Amino acid sequence: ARYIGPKCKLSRREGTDLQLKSGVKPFDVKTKKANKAPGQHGQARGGKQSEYSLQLREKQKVRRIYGVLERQFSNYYKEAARVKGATGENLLKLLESRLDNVVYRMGFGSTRAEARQLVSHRSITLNGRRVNIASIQVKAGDVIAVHEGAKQQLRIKNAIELAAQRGIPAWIEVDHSKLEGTFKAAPDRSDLPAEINESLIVELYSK
Amino acid sequence: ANSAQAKKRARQNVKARKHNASLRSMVRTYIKRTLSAIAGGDYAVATEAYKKAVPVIDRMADKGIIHKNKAARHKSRLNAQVKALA
Amino acid sequence: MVVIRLARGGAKKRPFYQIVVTDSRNARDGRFIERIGFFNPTAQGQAEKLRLDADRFAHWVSQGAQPSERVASLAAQAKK
Amino acid sequence: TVRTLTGKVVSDKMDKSIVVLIERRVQHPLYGKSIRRSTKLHAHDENNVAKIGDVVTIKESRPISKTKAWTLVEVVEAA
Amino acid sequence: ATTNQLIRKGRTTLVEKSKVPALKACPQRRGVCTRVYTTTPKKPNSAMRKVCRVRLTSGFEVSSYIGGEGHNLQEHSVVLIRGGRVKDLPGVRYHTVRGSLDCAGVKDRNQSRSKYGAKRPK
RNA sequence: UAACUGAAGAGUUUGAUCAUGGCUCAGAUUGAACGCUGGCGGCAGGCUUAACACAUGCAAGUCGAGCGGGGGAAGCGGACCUAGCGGCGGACGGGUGAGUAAUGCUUAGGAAUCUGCCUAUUAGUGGGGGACAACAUCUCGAAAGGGAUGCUAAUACCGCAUACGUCCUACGGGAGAAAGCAGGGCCUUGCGCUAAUAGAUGAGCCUAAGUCGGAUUAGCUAGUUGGUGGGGUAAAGGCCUACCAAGGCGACGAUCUGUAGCGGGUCUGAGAGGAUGAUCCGCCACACUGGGACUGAGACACGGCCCAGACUCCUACGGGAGGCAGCAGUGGGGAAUAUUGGACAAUGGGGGGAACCCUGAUCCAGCCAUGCCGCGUGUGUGAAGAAGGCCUUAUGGUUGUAAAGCACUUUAAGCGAGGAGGAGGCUACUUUAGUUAAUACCUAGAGAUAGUGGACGUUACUCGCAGAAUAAGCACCGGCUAACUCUGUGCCAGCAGCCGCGGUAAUACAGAGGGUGCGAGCGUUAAUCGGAUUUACUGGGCGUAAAGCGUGCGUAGGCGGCUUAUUAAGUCGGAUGUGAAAUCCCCGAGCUUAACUUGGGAAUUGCAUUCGAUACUGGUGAGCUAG
RNA sequence: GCAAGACUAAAACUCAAAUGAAUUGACGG
Ligand SMILES: [Mg+2]
Ligand SMILES: [Mg+2]
Ligand SMILES: [Mg+2]
Ligand SMILES: [Mg+2]
Ligand SMILES: [Mg+2]
Ligand SMILES: [Mg+2]
Ligand SMILES: [Mg+2]
Ligand SMILES: [Mg+2]
Ligand SMILES: [Mg+2]
Ligand SMILES: [Mg+2]
Ligand SMILES: [Mg+2]
Ligand SMILES: [Mg+2]
Ligand SMILES: [Mg+2]
Ligand SMILES: [Mg+2]
Ligand SMILES: [Mg+2]
Ligand SMILES: [Mg+2]
Ligand SMILES: [Mg+2]
Ligand SMILES: [Mg+2]
Ligand SMILES: [Mg+2]
Ligand SMILES: [Mg+2]
Ligand SMILES: [Mg+2]
Ligand SMILES: [Mg+2]
Ligand SMILES: [Mg+2]
Ligand SMILES: [Mg+2]
Ligand SMILES: [Mg+2]
Ligand SMILES: [Mg+2]
Ligand SMILES: [Mg+2]
Ligand SMILES: [Mg+2]
Ligand SMILES: [Mg+2]
Ligand SMILES: [Mg+2]
Ligand SMILES: [Mg+2]
Ligand SMILES: [Mg+2]
Ligand SMILES: [Mg+2]
Ligand SMILES: [Mg+2]
Ligand SMILES: [Mg+2]
Ligand SMILES: [Mg+2]
């Protein structure tokens, strides 16, 4: 399953933008109910803490800006705890090497959900195959192209506009003419937004 | 027995059992003649009974009615028991 | 009788055989004397199709083991 | 090439057979202290040599009797 | 205490006891109810608690509790019972499963409908 | 180059406090069950209870190239088929966990042993005889099953002959086998048969050490413990026996007694531990209950026999038959667990020279959210912040970019086309090498030319068509613990893991709105470990919280001053065997990914053997004087 | 054990406390 519902709700609860609604003039001032958690009495609530609410809301934040559910997320964690480095950055690199996220980052698909219907509908090519699993771990060097019968639809070319002035990071060398990939090695805990405090997630999964 | 081969095996078991019983009884009878002669005490009678009993024991051990080690044991013990007679 | 045969353990519809030297009365996937190689009939990509320890094979065909038909033709594929 | 044990003769009243006590120091698995355990072996001396109190040496043989598969090699300390 | 004391006499475990002896390590149990009646709670509580007196296929005969508002049990009803004791009723250590063999689901329920055997209303 | 990385606390005794101490809670797990809900796929798993009773079908046959008879299609016959007898198989594979606390199992070692088929190696396969089935004739019986009279062949049986080696010898000697069949030109090949050896396999035997409780079970044993003669085994042995001697086992737990298949492993845990022994592998035991043996290389034989028993069934009353803990299936019991499916295509197994036949093993398919893993149920924009619901101070707030609206997309499901791989081979066609009168025949080896050969199977997979179209629920919201308001109710109805809520503004009951958490699932019950340092080895205590015996003396035991020599038992180090595979872990390899499958390592911390080191502990000798 | 009894020594069931030391009050014939 995947979450199919109101999306600005998730940003209003998580406080931050969350990067959903990849919009022309969203600017997180498209809902105008921002700075106000959802619901009948989410208004008079700025929030203090619980130290379990803190860990939980950190985890839900990281989970909702990648579209992962809780079973897959806990599997990511159990794998990242196994790799030799630190657990939190291992986890962030696992979430970074997913195919739908790499598609979002290279520029095709405006959101991570549009980049997920792109992948699920086989409009993507990974080293030649027409994959349709959004959770495939792209490895260093893999080539990510658009499919031939799906590179003239305006949805991707007009998302390539939002791809600039926004992104195409260091660890991804993408040309917007051939519509191609070559994702190079994974990022580190210096290339990703630093407000994500993944130590909260590591301490949540040790409760 | 349920299948036809199981009852054929039962038939053949009956026939083999009769045959083997005759041969095994024969071996025991010759050993008993040797032992009765030994208890008699005479050395000539004992040695002739032993000379008659050895080929029957060897014959029935060749056919698998008794094992060859059984045959060797009888041939060894009866011999040691007739050599002590004289 | 000692035989050299295939023991089928893989996945459903994707067999993977261990070439084993065993006593022929044992179950196909049960007790064996010695594993000497393997056979992967599908073996896509970079995977090995057939590995067959030749000196152990020769040692056992010397002690009187009898290969199967399949293991005979496979031992023909090797050393060649 | 053989397996030898050493002990003390605790009985000799049986016809040409001794009872020997082998002492062993087995370490406790959980509490890690070597505790003394003992085992009585019915061994075979055909000459009726060893007397109760001797220190002797035995070696495992084929069975000589029901519960007697050890045979004496010599007396170390004729006490 | 001392090492020698531990090697001589070890450390003894006190095995626990089941709080649901009449279930016989089964998750639930079928019973036939011989008495449907009401009890009053303990010291600080006040109610008319609906209780069932079942004979179980495991040979026991125990009192279980009927949860929810409104039931249809009588004598000779075949019910499924499970663990879980009611705090203020001393000695009731079982619950009747609503929506089971003879115990129907609670009526007019719309929240926590799984726990009362109520089907989704349409 | 990795094979490792690891440990959280809360509530509750009081007016409050600190402590002690129980109880309870948050995690992981499951062959689960139950409630509500339910789209798909891939992998697994699926009577845990009555080792309760079983309808019906199937689960062990095969060989005519061992042998007589027969029977008949096509042409007096040749091909073919097979009831008998005789080979081999039926001791495997499959099921179960009742019994079993040690004749089991695990680890490490041993002798005194056998071992069909297979591999090498030797020496042979000479010549006779008497039968018995089938068959024919009659007969008993309801049947099952039998009887009688003749006739028969054989690789069935038994003599005789001859033994490289084999066996017994008192060392001189003595003793002991076999069987032919087939293909080609009496000769050769094979396939058999005999006698041995040693290799494999497989099994039997022995030793030591471990393997749940219970002392509110302390004595047990009289073939019992040992010896000798004899007998018996494939083999050591009180295994059996007669005699002799008296022993043997026990508080390091004998005997008795409750429980229990055991291991690799599994779950949990930071570990140390603790629970556990489904599925997979090994070992053992068992086959309706209790005995017994036969035949065989192997059985004291799951679908063999005999005898006893219960139970079921047929009967003409005389008699007969049967054994799902094989696969399906039924009744029953139960909270609860599936189809009376397909094929031998693959891997095996049995028979056969082969052709081939058999195979409920296996490979597949069905059913079940039972688990794990994967995917889907759309994606963008969209404010008049519509309507409606809910709250409201009646203005507004909230549901909410949510919806409409506009623009796209087509996974999976549906419908069409293609489409691997699982099949190595065999048959024909030519040759080479052999063996041998022989280029025959038979073995092996090549080469290309076509025939074949897939249960699954509409296979995976690929490519088109259509259309947002076919696809979201469950628990919770007082604290622990993430998430709150209204209305109804009024110590009632009810809720409840614990604390506790409810007596007229209930954030705790019921409904609604909103929200949180999970999601094709979500809750509840049950169970194990955890948190619990709450049995404390790692890692606790005992003045007053539970806890120092009333006090001594002493047995077993534990532990013991200082110096020195020696030993090398403990201890340490190395080497060498072993520690099955699977699993766990690490690298990496294939499935579109993941589950899953798989290569190699690491590990298996053990035990054994052997070599070394002697500080410490122990032994032994010698001293000393602080106890 | 003459007996009175002593010693060894449970379980079902039940409760969510029981307890120690100290503190602030109140009370004390
Ligand atoms: Mg036959
Ligand atoms: Mg014995
Ligand atoms: Mg026939
Ligand atoms: Mg059992
Ligand atoms: Mg013959
Ligand atoms: Mg002869
Ligand atoms: Mg002859
Ligand atoms: Mg003796
Ligand atoms: Mg004797
Ligand atoms: Mg003797
Ligand atoms: Mg005892
Ligand atoms: Mg049992
Ligand atoms: Mg712990
Ligand atoms: Mg045989
Ligand atoms: Mg026999
Ligand atoms: Mg059988
Ligand atoms: Mg049966
Ligand atoms: Mg069955
Ligand atoms: Mg029933
Ligand atoms: Mg087959
Ligand atoms: Mg499709
Ligand atoms: Mg094919
Ligand atoms: Mg809260
Ligand atoms: Mg409720
Ligand atoms: Mg109210
Ligand atoms: Mg409510
Ligand atoms: Mg899922
Ligand atoms: Mg503990
Ligand atoms: Mg304490
Ligand atoms: Mg006290
Ligand atoms: Mg005192
Ligand atoms: Mg002392
Ligand atoms: Mg001492
Ligand atoms: Mg040493
Ligand atoms: Mg292993
Ligand atoms: Mg001294």
Automatic annotation (TrEMBL), chain A:
Family annotation (Pfam families): Ribosomal_S4 (PF00163), S4 (PF01479)
Q: Name one GO biological process term.
A: translation
Q: Does the keyword Oxidoreductase apply?
A: no
> Per the database record, which ranges form the RNA-binding S4 domain?
97-161
- Output the Gene3D superfamilies linked to this UniProt entry: Ribosomal Protein S4 Delta 41, Chain A, domain 1 (1.10.1050.10), RNA-binding S4 domain (3.10.290.10)
Boundaries of each Small ribosomal subunit protein uS4 N-terminal domain copy?
A: 2-96
One GO cellular component term, please give it. small ribosomal subunit
Q: Which InterPro entries match?
A: Ribosomal_uS4 (IPR022801), Ribosomal_uS4_bac-type (IPR005709), Ribosomal_uS4_CS (IPR018079), Ribosomal_uS4_N (IPR001912), S4_RNA-bd (IPR002942), S4_RNA-bd_sf (IPR036986)
Q: List the GO molecular function terms.
A: rRNA binding; structural constituent of ribosome
- Ribonucleoprotein as a keyword? yes
- Self-association and partners: Part of the 30S ribosomal subunit. Contacts protein S5. The interaction surface between S4 and S5 is involved in control of translational fidelity.
Quote the PANTHER family the UniProt record gives: 30S 40S RIBOSOMAL PROTEIN, SMALL RIBOSOMAL SUBUNIT PROTEIN US4M
Name-wise, this protein is Small ribosomal subunit protein uS4
Q: Which gene encodes it?
A: rpsD
Automatic annotation (TrEMBL), chain B:
Source species of the chain: Acinetobacter baumannii (strain ATCC 19606 / DSM 30007 / JCM 6841 / CCUG 19606 / CIP 70.34 / NBRC 109757 / NCIMB 12457 / NCTC 12156 / 81)
Mind telling me which Pfam families this protein's record contains? Ribosomal_S20p
Basic residues: which segments have biased composition?
A: 6-20
One GO location term (cellular component): small ribosomal subunit
The alphabetized list of GO BP terms reads: translation
Alphabetized NCBIfam families for the sequence: S20
Keywords assigned by UniProt, alphabetized: Ribonucleoprotein, Ribosomal protein, RNA-binding, rRNA-binding
Which HAMAP family does UniProt cross-reference here? Answer: Ribosomal_bS20 (MF_00500)
Recorded superkingdom: Bacteria
Region annotation Disordered: residue ranges? 1-20
Quote the function comment for this protein. Binds directly to 16S ribosomal RNA.
Family assignment from sequence similarity: Belongs to the bacterial ribosomal protein bS20 family.
Q: What is this protein called?
A: Small ribosomal subunit protein bS20
UniProtKB/TrEMBL annotation, chain C:
Sorted alphabetically, the keyword list is: Ribonucleoprotein, Ribosomal protein
Listed HAMAP family = Ribosomal_bS16 (MF_00385)
Do you know which SUPFAM superfamilies this protein is assigned to?
Ribosomal protein S16 (SSF54565)
InterPro entries under this entry?
Ribosomal_bS16, Ribosomal_bS16_CS, Ribosomal_bS16_dom_sf
Domain of life, per lineage: Bacteria
* PROSITE patterns found in the cross-reference section: RIBOSOMAL_S16
What are its GO cellular component terms? cytoplasm; small ribosomal subunit
Q: Using the record, list the residue span of the signal peptide; answer none if the entry has no such feature.
A: none
Q: Which gene encodes it?
A: rpsP
Q: What does the sequence similarity comment in the record state about its family?
A: Belongs to the bacterial ribosomal protein bS16 family.
Q: Which GO terms describe its biological process?
A: translation
Write one Gene Ontology MF term: structural constituent of ribosome
According to its UniProt entry, this protein's organism is Acinetobacter baumannii (strain ATCC 19606 / DSM 30007 / JCM 6841 / CCUG 19606 / CIP 70.34 / NBRC 109757 / NCIMB 12457 / NCTC 12156 / 81)
Instruction: Report the protein name in the record.
Output: Small ribosomal subunit protein bS16
Tell me the Pfam families matching this sequence: Ribosomal_S16
TrEMBL record, chain D:
The molecular function terms of the Gene Ontology recorded here are:
rRNA binding; structural constituent of ribosome
A GO biological process of this protein is: translation
- Known PROSITE patterns for this protein? RIBOSOMAL_S17
Q: So where does this one cross the membrane?
A: none
Cite a GO CC annotation.
cytosolic small ribosomal subunit
Keywords attached to this entry? Ribonucleoprotein, Ribosomal protein, RNA-binding, rRNA-binding
Entry superkingdom: Bacteria
- Chloroplast among keywords: no
Record note on quaternary structure: Part of the 30S ribosomal subunit.
User: What does the sequence similarity comment in the record state about its family?
Assistant: Belongs to the universal ribosomal protein uS17 family.
What role does this protein play?
One of the primary rRNA binding proteins, it binds specifically to the 5'-end of 16S ribosomal RNA.
Record-linked HAMAP family: Ribosomal_uS17_B
Q: State what protein this is by name.
A: Small ribosomal subunit protein uS17
